[PDB]
Amino acid sequence: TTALVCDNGSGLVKAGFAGDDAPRAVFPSIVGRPRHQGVMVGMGQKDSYVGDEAQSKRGILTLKYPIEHGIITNWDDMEKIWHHTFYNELRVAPEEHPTLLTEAPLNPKANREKMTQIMFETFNVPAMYVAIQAVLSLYASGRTTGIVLDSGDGVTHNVPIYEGYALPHAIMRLDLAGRDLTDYLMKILTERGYSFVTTAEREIVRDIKEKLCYVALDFENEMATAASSSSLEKSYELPDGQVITIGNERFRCPETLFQPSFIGMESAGIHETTYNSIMKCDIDIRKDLYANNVLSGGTTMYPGIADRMQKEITALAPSTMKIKIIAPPERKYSVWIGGSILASLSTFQQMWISKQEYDEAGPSIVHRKCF
Amino acid sequence: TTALVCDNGSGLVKAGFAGDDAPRAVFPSIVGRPRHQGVMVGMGQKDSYVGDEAQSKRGILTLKYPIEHGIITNWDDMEKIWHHTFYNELRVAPEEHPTLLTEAPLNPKANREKMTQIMFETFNVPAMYVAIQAVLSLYASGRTTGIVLDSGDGVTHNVPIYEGYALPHAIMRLDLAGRDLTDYLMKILTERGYSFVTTAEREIVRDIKEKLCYVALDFENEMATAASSSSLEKSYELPDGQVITIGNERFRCPETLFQPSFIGMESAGIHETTYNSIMKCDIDIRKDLYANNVLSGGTTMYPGIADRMQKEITALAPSTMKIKIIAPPERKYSVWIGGSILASLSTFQQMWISKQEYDEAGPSIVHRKCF
Amino acid sequence: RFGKFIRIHFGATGKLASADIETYLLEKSRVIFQLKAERDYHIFYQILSNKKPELLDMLLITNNPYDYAFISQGETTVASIDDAEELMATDNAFDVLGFTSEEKNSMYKLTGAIMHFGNMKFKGGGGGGGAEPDGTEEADKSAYLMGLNSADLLKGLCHPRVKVGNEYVTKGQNVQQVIYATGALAKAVYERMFNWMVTRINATLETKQPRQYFIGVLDIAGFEIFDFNSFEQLCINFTNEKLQQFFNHHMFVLEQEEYKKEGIEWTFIDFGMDLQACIDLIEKPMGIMSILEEECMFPKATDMTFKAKLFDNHLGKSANFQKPRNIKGKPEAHFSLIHYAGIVDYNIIGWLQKNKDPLNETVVGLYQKSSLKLLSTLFANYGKGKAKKGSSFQTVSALHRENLNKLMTNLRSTHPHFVRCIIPNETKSPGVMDNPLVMHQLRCNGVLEGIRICRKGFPNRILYGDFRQRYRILN
């Protein structure tokens, strides 16, 4: 048989059969509802547009993400997402296919328990397993040590692993992610005279953020260059014309990662959190962790982010320690690749949670030692 | 049984059976009364001439229009019009034929309430329904999106529809219509030497407007050409002789639509109201509305109006959008065709307001979801 | 395909008088649309026979069937029957018939004209929505064939005229609408040709004897079943199901008559509604046929929307509509219905495009004005004020239903008798049998339904004399 590797994540569901090189179906994780009444009769509009279809009907729909920060807040919407993924994007019945799910560290136990219950009850999958989004990313990089920084759309976290032994006391989680960057970009774009309020145009602002924003190696020098010259301004074409030009805002949006105080958060920057995590571990493995930094998640796709992170960590770290940052081109899909690799392992076939086991011992099986 | 589609409109009542390709009966909505005494004894002239017959006796009657701008102002005259339509034109008993009626947007609720009360009580129609002009016009055009500009003899309104969903906050209405154009043509003909005052001559002026007026692509250039050249002058034959020649007055009457300031109206031209309505809607559907602009109504039948509208909108709209205007040859009867199509649908049979529902919920039942 | 019917009349003294022939339920979809592994009517293939070069050269017919569009879509040719001698025999039979050879030339040239409508092409206007023709050589030769004017025909196709109130106005047509109109015109002209041929044959066969009570003979297509059932198969199955329901009602009436004759009367429940439950899901409003008819009218209908509407309106709500089933890697299945012959699945794809039959009025008027015999076939086509049906509002499904009704209102007026023919084997070898073929024949013939209806009551009835002489030794 074959195993399904579903990665719910947040803002992007990617899924595909285990053993494939790349995920087969990737689409945004949104649920759209019509906010108008409809005058034409006989069309028979559906009451809920789910997945990529909602992206084509943004102008007559209100879009809601079922996942705020890793956790699921609207279970009906998530069930709709899962049903659409299983029956439309993949067109494969889950009755005879084990499933591998991924979630971030340090999440409420009720979330995992309810996910397992829904998957065993509604879809009746033969078996399922849950993994951390960081260990799979480490698998996908062909490594066995180092720290992994998984900066997704909902949550960011750092997980140090040495020789396959995780260190729970050094795992760090920060709620700043791509969604907050998009909100900040919407907020600061007002100073230039552009107003974005509707949820539909939040997607537009996300598109500008993806296409134009970049990370500055140095902040003050870039601010001075932008204030003096105008070579950094770039123009973007909106869906209805009226091209808009953005300058200094181009690199202010991604700086929030290193400067959380822009959005009011008291927590330290990404580099400082990584550095603190590095020293939170023992002293005999700090060199390898320094030399095996791993990045994953869409938010880490900004141009020039790797250089800035390396410079900051080198400034913080002792001079006599070599610092290297691994930034493969496929950061976004690294987690799914790692999950597919893990599912293809022969030794993993005994770690599945059988339906009979769940029925006998109840939903709390996942938390028990039969992880 | 079969459904009956009647369109009161304004200045022209058009009715027929559902499923037909064109209305069977089309005639002016005029009620005439004799203003003289009458000396011959025995002929027994009737006290009221209704419909097209009043045109034959136009010279001895005081023609009155029962409706000014969509709103009915003389209910007895409207009852006479409906009776003539049902009996002397279609020769059918409304006791066994559901009736579909057409009504313009943004009108007093008492209008619809009285219309339904008259239909249910006076004529005892088994069931009836009321629809909006814009939706029917879009139905007849074979489209599901776009902004439709319906300009009849009473009122000109723009309604944007996207994927069968209306945008009520973007619906625009303007009282400028064909009747105002005829009045302005009367006002502007007097400067040449021809005076038309009596209501009978209203029809002559309207016929001249229909037969000779046209829309100029450029106003200043055409005025300059007419100031020197005499190639724009055309002659018309009155019903008694003394042909009248008109020069620049032919293309100045329809300019009121784009230049309402001629007749003192504060609002802007139709070309500007359409653009404002488009910009009212959401940003994600503006391209489709631009590319699916629809025209309907008799007043939009002037030659060259489509090109002028396209030029104006292209000037207003961004240069990176393709502006396309759809002007089918049968603009005048588009609404009735749409009504016939709507009535011929099978799923529409459960949306009729049955007699029992009206009796139980009273005349107000019109304002429920059966809009 | 067509439902041939023959009424054999008799004289007053119970002697043979004369015969009458009628046709019903002729399928028009086969003319334009053909399945991949199936052919069209034998007429076109027979006409392309090379043994008569005079017709090919005087009709300017391309001898290559591949070039033409209507025929090349389906299977080009099979070794079914040698068309040469069959065509020769048909021509000889026509020659020995009552009418002359000019009429035969007329049918041949009209068939050739039907053949060339596929070469028409249209290009959307650069500055306008309306689409105008690009090539005209095919149009020119066709108009020459019918004796019409190419320019007038092109204007009519592009700009149909319609009467509104008391004045004529021109309507705009796009590429899709004009293509549908051309297809509808071809189908309608072919149907009228066939009807006129049937009437001529009936007139020739007619003799001057009085027409007293008649004996009907009805031949119809069976309950055909495929792994790729489509709209035509749906219509055939619906007609067969209606016929079976009639048979069930007749048998029930006979059973009640026998019961009242014998005084053994129980279980008065009629045996009709049980099968009529499926019928009510097809012809009645909100049925599959009505939903399809409405959907083809909607300007933006698509197959997915049609399937969604069917599922919303029938899954769980009806007792006969259910999900499809996938076996042995069947190519596709969208929905499955339960009939008297078992479970049958149909394919939605392609139904919407072929359901439309929008005729053009101005083209019919031009035909009536023609200088050829064609005007006779198109002689008539479309104080109380009854309302007719719009050209655009014309679908094949409705006509079928109407035809079936006008058949049932006639066949129900006579006492029916049933004859069943069963093929013993697929091969020509006598004696040998293929059990699955016999099972399929029995299932499609409704014999199982008869036995099931009989078993629920008391099918075994024996006289007291026989029962005594055979079973009295027991006690």
Ligand SMILES: Nc1ncnc2c1ncn2[C@@H]1O[C@H](COP(=O)(O)OP(=O)(O)O)[C@@H](O)[C@H]1O
């Ligand atoms: N090249 C890029 N530039 C800027 N932002 C990006 C880029 N690629 C992805 N993103 C951001 O990453 C987010 C997607 O994160 P994702 O990896 O899907 O998280 P999860 O795995 O939790 O769904 C998007 O919201 C997007 O804004």
Ligand SMILES: Nc1ncnc2c1ncn2[C@@H]1O[C@H](COP(=O)(O)OP(=O)(O)O)[C@@H](O)[C@H]1O
């Ligand atoms: N060919 C034409 N050119 C200019 N104006 C026309 C033409 N035909 C009709 N009209 C105008 O259109 C008006 C009729 O509008 P109509 O379609 O009846 O509106 P409604 O549908 O509200 O009744 C007439 O008053 C006439 O002045």
Ligand SMILES: [Mg+2]
């Ligand atoms: Mg993620």
Ligand SMILES: [Mg+2]
């Ligand atoms: Mg109107």
